[PDB]
Design a protein around this ligand. Sequence first.
Ligand SMILES: Nc1ncnc2c1ncn2[C@@H]1O[C@H](COP(=O)(O)OP(=O)(O)O)[C@@H](O)[C@H]1O
Ligand SMILES: Nc1ncnc2c1ncn2[C@@H]1O[C@H](COP(=O)(O)OP(=O)(O)O)[C@@H](O)[C@H]1O
Ligand SMILES: [Mg+2]
Ligand SMILES: [Mg+2]
Lengths: 470, 472
Amino acid sequence: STVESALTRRIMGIETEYGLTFVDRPDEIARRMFRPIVEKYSSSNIFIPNGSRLYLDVGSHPEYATAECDNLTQLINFEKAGDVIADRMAVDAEESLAKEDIAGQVYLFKNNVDSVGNSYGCHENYLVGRSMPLKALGKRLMPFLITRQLICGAGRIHHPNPLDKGESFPLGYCISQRSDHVWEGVSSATTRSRPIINTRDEPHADSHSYRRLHVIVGDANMAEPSIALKVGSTLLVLEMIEADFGLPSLELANDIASIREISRDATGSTLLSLKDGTTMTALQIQQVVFEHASKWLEQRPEPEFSGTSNTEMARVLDLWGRMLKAIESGDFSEVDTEIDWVIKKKLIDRFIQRGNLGLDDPKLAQVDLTYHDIRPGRGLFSVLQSRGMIKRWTTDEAILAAVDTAPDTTRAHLRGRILKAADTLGVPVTVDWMRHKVNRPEPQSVELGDPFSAVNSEVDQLIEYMTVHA
Amino acid sequence: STVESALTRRIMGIETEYGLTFVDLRPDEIARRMFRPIVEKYSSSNIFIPNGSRLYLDVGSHPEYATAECDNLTQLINFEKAGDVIADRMAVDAEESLAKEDIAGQVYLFKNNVDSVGNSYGCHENYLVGRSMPLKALGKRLMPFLITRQLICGAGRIHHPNPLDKGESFPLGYCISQRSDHVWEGVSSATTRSRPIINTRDEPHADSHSYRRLHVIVGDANMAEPSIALKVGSTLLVLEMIEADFGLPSLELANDIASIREISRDATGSTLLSLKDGTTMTALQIQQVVFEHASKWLEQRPEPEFSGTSNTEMARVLDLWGRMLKAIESGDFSEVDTEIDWVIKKKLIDRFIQRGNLGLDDPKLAQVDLTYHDIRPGRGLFSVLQSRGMIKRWTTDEAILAAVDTAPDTTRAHLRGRILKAADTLGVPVTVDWMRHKVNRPEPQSVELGDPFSAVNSEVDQLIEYMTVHAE
Ligand SMILES: Nc1ncnc2c1ncn2[C@@H]1O[C@H](COP(=O)(O)OP(=O)(O)O)[C@@H](O)[C@H]1O
Ligand SMILES: Nc1ncnc2c1ncn2[C@@H]1O[C@H](COP(=O)(O)OP(=O)(O)O)[C@@H](O)[C@H]1O
Ligand SMILES: [Mg+2]
Ligand SMILES: [Mg+2]
């Protein structure tokens, strides 16, 4: 018939298994043999049975990304589980070193800046519906975000850099760790530019229904009530926008014009220029959003399934209100076990008082840093919390459970089921946020496009398939 | 306004970077040691390397090397042989890693299909075919050829009956094929683990509408380069004749696996096969008829415009195919005895038998049967013989050596290779797969390569530029 139909140029490939024997367990032979290539070429994105991901690359900061959460307290549990998991890695490294002659300490800091000026992110991801308009973000969300540091910042001691060009801020305590770096990123017209809000990321969801909103402006927080207020306040703001609840447009003429200045002023009197031509203080912006959020709660429909409860939002708003009254009155005694920058500042002030120290005293720098050391009993946050000087949002029991067990209300529940079977059956599997694949014998794939669903019959078939060939 | 629009249940997640420091080695060495246990336990076992290939490394399993996508016969040989080099290097480095520890000994990696304990190891072939042809109709017309192909390309083994089995149907004897018994066992079981000889239903790793993937399990792992060429080359000509509807007769078998184990034991090729149409042919006769048509096909075969396997190479394939069939018919193998694994191996085995007045079950011969497949240069029998001029070459050491570090330049593997080379030179992470390539930082960038034939892509150039610009 048709001779031109034969594919004379065709794609082809061979897969060959090799018999591996060692002549004097053997499992130790295979492991040492695979080691060089595994460490060099394996993917750096590592998914673990609690549904979370670790990003580990020998030239990069280690990063922990929580599993998908549908509830505020649950999110807190899983973020704290990350600190436990990362700390355990450090502890095990110290021991393997100690087994060798070499001894010393491994430190992991959860903060946003290092002695050399390097930046470290703590990023938020929020699912929103295609319902919410592009425009609203700049108008409504953004002004809240620029000032949110007043309520949730982790604090840092700022030293002027003599080689810095174009601007100088004096030696001083800032409520925010991130603000100067955020300013640089936004100001940059080069590859160095970092946008504060990004709606265009791969949604890790069905693209039609769902957008993923990625926010870079927040500090890494230690105290559980500070994480709760940071994420909690933001959740309420998103709901009000989604509900068209009447949050006024606060839109700023230039988003970063005041961001560094707000950081230096704990009275919140910093003045921002609205695109209106009008001006408001950072505190006034927060008081506006707070008052509207307080009215939202009165009409907030209770979620029928999972979600964050009205009772829990009332705890969020209670702390929110108390913090604004403290910034306004200048009296922090009601908030000073809950808010990172305040807790830290209170300790720094005791040291200054007692030792008559200056703000650049190495002793203070040690407080500012070791507050962020995640090692239980060594780190300053751990000591404070153990003595009752930092209040709890959640419990140790819940954090411990989240270390090995995935969220049971979301897609992560399914990823967790797959990984646990893989561990027990001994079968290799490859997962990501959406795509889940068994590599052998035949490559069975499943795509989980709905991040809200903890039920899929395809996943049940996949797990039985694995069980069949174990 | 609309209160029910608020998502009071929404999805959320946090990503946190930690600062890492050590107070008294290189911080690189500190991170490496810290990450190791989690990397080893939880990292993906599919590992993509710069030459475009993929290693499957999992402490539970047999190490497997899958070649990069190839579009030419000789190129495919180069990349299969590169795999043995790469696997051997892993073994050699493990020997010197174990030496540091008090453990001494030799690492052996065998490229064969069976071990002394009864495990099976596969050498599987993947072929892109035209999506025009219905999946099952292709198998039917491919199968007669595939079942009998072991005659021309088998690697050989000594079969040892299990005396404890009273239901053992086969005696002590030399088989031309390694895989036949295990393939027979996998097809016939009611058990859900039964696996087919041909599978079309695999993910194409190509445009779903344009191309279909053929996955074939019946072949032996081969050492001799002309054995690989014949196995794959003959199969390419058969696929071509089918796609061109050249008139290759339908030889469909009554039962696919009925004769598979029996053919393996008979080097005269006289094993009988029952056809659907009610006639019967010997294994040697099916091969003769397929070969006769392939020979006419070559006369009409249009020279590929770009790359592919040329008509000159296919003529080499047919030269060998014809000589093998003549040897099988006459019983005189003197012309093919440097080119075909089972023939090469049997010549060796027969020599020892004669020198020693040995029986076929002598451990010495079992050692030969095994060590022919040892891939270590100078230690393995195959490598010793190839040095002597006792085994003919289809390709060169230089092409194989280049294939170790550099991907095929004619297919999508070229692009995956460039990306992974840039990641190595820039010291930055990237996650790649057959189709997908992504970086997470500073901002996530992803590219999908759906076309396995294309070696040129703008998104790839830019991805590599993005990696370069943002690299430390
Ligand atoms: N489009 C294609 N057509 C034919 N073979 C392919 C194609 N893409 C990749 N291959 C080959 O298939 C083998 C990989 O097997 P596959 O099942 O696709 O992935 P994995 O085996 O890693 O799960 C490799 O040898 C590769 O060269
Ligand atoms: N549908 C979703 N909505 C919101 N957040 C999600 C969703 N899916 C995953 N995430 C979160 O995104 C974070 C990881 O994303 P990442 O792999 O960094 O993607 P990218 O590199 O594209 O930003 C995790 O915290 C995870 O829980
Ligand atoms: Mg495979
Ligand atoms: Mg990320």
